Amino acid sequence: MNNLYRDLAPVTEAAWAEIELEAARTFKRHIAGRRVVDVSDPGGPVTAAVSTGRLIDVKAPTNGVIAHLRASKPLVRLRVPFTLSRNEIDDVERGSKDSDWEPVKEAAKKLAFVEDRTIFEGYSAASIEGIRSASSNPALTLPEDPREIPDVISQALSELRLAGVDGPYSVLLSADVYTKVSETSDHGYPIREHLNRLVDGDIIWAPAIDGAFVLTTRGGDFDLQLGTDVAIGYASHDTDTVRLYLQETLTFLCYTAEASVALSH
Amino acid sequence: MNNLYRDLAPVTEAAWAEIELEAARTFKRHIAGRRVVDVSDPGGPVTAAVSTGRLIDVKAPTNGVIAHLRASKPLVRLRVPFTLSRNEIDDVERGSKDSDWEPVKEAAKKLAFVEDRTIFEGYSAASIEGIRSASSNPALTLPEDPREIPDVISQALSELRLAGVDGPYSVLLSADVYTKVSETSDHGYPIREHLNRLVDGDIIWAPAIDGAFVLTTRGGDFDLQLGTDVAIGYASHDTDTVRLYLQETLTFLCYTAEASVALSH
Amino acid sequence: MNNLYRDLAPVTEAAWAEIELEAARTFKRHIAGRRVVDVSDPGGPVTAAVSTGRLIDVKAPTNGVIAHLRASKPLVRLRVPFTLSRNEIDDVERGSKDSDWEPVKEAAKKLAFVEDRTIFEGYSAASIEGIRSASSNPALTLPEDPREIPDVISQALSELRLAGVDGPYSVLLSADVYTKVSETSDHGYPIREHLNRLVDGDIIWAPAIDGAFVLTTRGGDFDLQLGTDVAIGYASHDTDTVRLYLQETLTFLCYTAEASVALSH
């Protein structure tokens, strides 16, 4: 067995298939970051750091010796525990199709939110700079009126053009901004369609982020490094409940500072 | 023979084909529910209940015995009798093509209305909770002005987005609401087209329901269980008329409470 | 895995084989009901109810609609927990052949007693009418003197003959009555042999029932429906003991009211 200790969990095979399906579905729906960044293959469990290729000056060991430390970025392992009713698990073999997988959905939504907020806003404790912090283009303010959203977005499209950047540009919106441009309409279309006319990429719902992000998806600018992708593991169990977790280990690198514009309220 | 006792009816083969065609046509046109819910294969005549996979605590038979009743949902058999003129039946072999099949059409419309109102509004006596009652998302009020319909509908699309739900969303309208958004026009399109722009599913005419329903058609959320599909059976006959019936047996299950928004006036 | 969670139990393979053998043996010895009634194949875990084929009038949904609920009988799941010493379990691999399987035997005897008392005396909470309650033939009183038992039994054989019934008749006795007709002797035979001369079926020891039952075993009159047959499942464990259970899910149907005579004290 492995670190998931999956065979020790009192979960049947059919219940496991339903839990895997629910977690994978809810996660994909709430991920916006993997649609725009380069996603590496999983390094594996032993992978601990990503080389940046830079060098750090250290106090010379002896006379005439020049020493340099190799710089690297550590992976962070992110774990979201959740708790399942054993009655709901037992219902699945009897043929129930409405078993309560709400904790699985909440854990997948929380893991997806962490991953997206780590990619776009950073996680300083894990030495990850967000796309918002690593952007060299000027930051823009989103207006109160949703009918004035496409104007400011177009100004962001000016800045990537002034930065000398090609590629399909894509706009990612926070859930508040996505709702505002979805529910306001002008001439038989919502403002989301007006945003769709400005770019050759995609208007992407990004419920974890704040504000908005416009960026190129030409490739090679944004890199998500995975040691291991999302997995479900077993912690402990009692007569009534099974404690499990969702787990993934990653770091994020931004190679190109001028490939994005961040917007705030 | 079977319970339809079809060979006992004084109905010719050509008249039977015309009656089957008329009933099937009028039924499909008036069904909205089967276009959005999962429809099972017919279980057969012996099928009487659907297992929910839950358990009900009962008074222990003896000391040290723990007993539980299996929960289930009963099927309901729905029968709509109708009466045909025997002269109209006899006209068909002579080559008439305008035989009065109005009772067949009224029976098919009434059966379709019952089935749709059972799916969406429930039938408490048959222990069926409607989609409106089983929805956990908040209910919305439809405005008087049809030009303000697409706004409220978009708010419903917000709620399924706040519920964490994917899939093609579909809007079902009552006949009053469908007529109102069909006959009012803005900038060369009726408001029905404005509703069509908001979703990737379908604006569906639902003449049996009240208000409106917005819901996902991703699958696995709404399940119509059929023991036997719609069939035409023979009751009795006299010199002038043949009494027949339309009959179907079903139950409806909603597995996912947050997959729909109900709207009312 | 399944709902038994059998691989989670700290029970070795040899100990499992001994427990299965002990439970199966003790159960068969104490079952009288399956020897006389028709026993269906196991429906499976999803099976929840048995269709009776009857209809229940319900308040018409709308005008001109006639509705009927399908009648059914729910299965009941019967669980008898028991507790095993882990030292006795560990003794089996070392080669012990006298490991204390008394709790297994007591659980099998209790499960068998419940099943037989459910078949013959009913379980109202599970909507099961016993053979004694569903019999339309008159009830008889068993006499105090065991030498007068065969007389009354013969009167019961008159009643099935007056009911117009064929087939091998079988007599089932309570443990008190079986002991009384076993230990009293007349002319070199016990009274049990005198009972054996009256029927072409079998004198059957039935320790769970009260009184006596005479009935035909021609087939098709008494039906035991099993969703799942007797199985051993794992609940929980500590350093000293393993909690397990015996479990079976069933209902009982009596189709023929005049196929039996019940006797009481």
Numbering used by the authors:
A (entry chain O), B (entry chain Q), C (entry chain SA): 1 to 265
Q: What did the original publication write about this model?
A:
In addition, we studied partial encapsulin structures to characterise stable encapsulin shell intermediates in vitro, by using low pH conditions to disassemble encapsulin shells, followed by reassembly at neutral pH. To explore the structural landscape of encapsulin shell formation, we used 2D and 3D (focused) classification and local symmetry to determine the structure of different stable encapsulin intermediates in an incomplete assembly state. This resulted in structures of three distinct intermediates of the encapsulin shell; a 48-mer (3,427 particles, 5.4 Å), a 52-mer (4,378 particles, 4.5 Å) and a 54-mer (6,294 particles, 4.6 Å). All three intermediates have an even number of monomers, appear to be closed on one side of the shell, and miss subunits on the other end. All three stable intermediates have an overall icosahedral structure with RMSD values for the 48,52 and 54-mer compared to the structure of the full shell of 1.08 Å, 0.60 Å and 2.66 Å respectively, although the 54-mer is, compared to the full encapsulin, flattened in one direction and elongated perpendicularly to it. The 52-mer consists of 39 fully resolved, and 13 less well resolved monomers, and the 54-mer consists of 27 fully resolved monomers and 27 less well resolved monomers. Not surprisingly, we observed higher cross-correlation values for Enctb monomers on the far side of the opening and lower cross-correlation values closer to the opening; in particular directly on the edges. On the edges of the intermediate encapsulin shells, we observed many points of three and fivefold symmetry with one or more Enctb subunits missing. However, all dimers (in total 77) have both Enctb subunits present, and where a subunit around five or three fold symmetry is missing, its dimeric partner is also missing. Our intermediate structures indicate that the structure of larger partial shells is largely icosahedral, with some deviations observed in the 54-mer.
